Amino acid sequence: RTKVFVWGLNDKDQLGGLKGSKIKVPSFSETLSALNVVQVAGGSKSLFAVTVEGKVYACGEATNGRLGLGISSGTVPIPRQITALSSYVVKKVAVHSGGRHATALTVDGKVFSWGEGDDGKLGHFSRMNCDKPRLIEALKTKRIRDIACGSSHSAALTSSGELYTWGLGEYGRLGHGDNTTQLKPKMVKVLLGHRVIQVACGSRDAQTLALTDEGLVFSWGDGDFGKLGRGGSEGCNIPQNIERLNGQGVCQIECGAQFSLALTKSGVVWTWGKGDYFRLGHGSDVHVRKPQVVEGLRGKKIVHVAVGALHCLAVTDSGQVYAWGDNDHGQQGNGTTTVNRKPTLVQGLEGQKITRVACGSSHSVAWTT
């Protein structure tokens, strides 16, 4: 039994069956609460749920085959199972908040991809769209442990700790020492000798973040607005260590629209990048070019975080969700369309031990377990 709550933009029914288009208060999801979810994940006006059984459901805008349901034009208003993956136990779906493609990882380590095919982000040696999940052949002999997708590139890491990237090469977000597009997965050779345990991918002129099992965070790709975390705006196509975060116990990394976020094991949140519309959480909309602690959450032990395009969710260990950032479509959950300049307690979730959050482009999810 897992209760799932959604709010935010609903113009394409990306919330799985609620009336209205601006759900400004977290609303109980009948359909999603029924599935017994282990993960929810938001793309561009899209929503995916991975269930304990290992099945995947999808709803929202269907364009570019982003939902993987064998179509490419409508909206899918009620969460629908991705039958193409029904012979597999899926463990995780990786999709970006500004994303029109996704990947799914099985428990036995296989990676499928579907959706928009531009720049090779599906990893199939082509730029073709896949309306239905397709096995990434390049990785069949690799035991994949984690996956991520930006808007224009993808990543996957092995149980032994090697990171793979593929997709758009422009602005060096792939990390291979050049700006070349890769239509198949390619190993980030610079990071060999570090066991990479987590990776996160940005959108548009995108950054990439990696996390090693020693707590070192690396970044590379586009440098606009200081989302690389080393000051100024210079980009690089080779992973560099974000020195500010060493020794801090970073256990989760995320990439929204043009900014970066890190959570530590002690419960601290750091953000940096493009500040417009208050997506960083520091109470002003200025850019932050090296990681800064979200002060508005001192003393609250955050246990899970999620980012959308312009908003963030943080979950405390007592089951409270804090939101900050833009609110054009209600994705803050403060009952209005007013921006949350600071971390702001989310409304309508009392009596709920919320454990996990997720974000799409303009929508929000919180569930229990």
Binding site: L9, K45, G98, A257, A309
Partner: peptide, 9 residues
Amino acid sequence: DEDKDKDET
């Protein structure tokens, strides 16, 4: 903004 969705409803 390039990342602000629009409400097509």
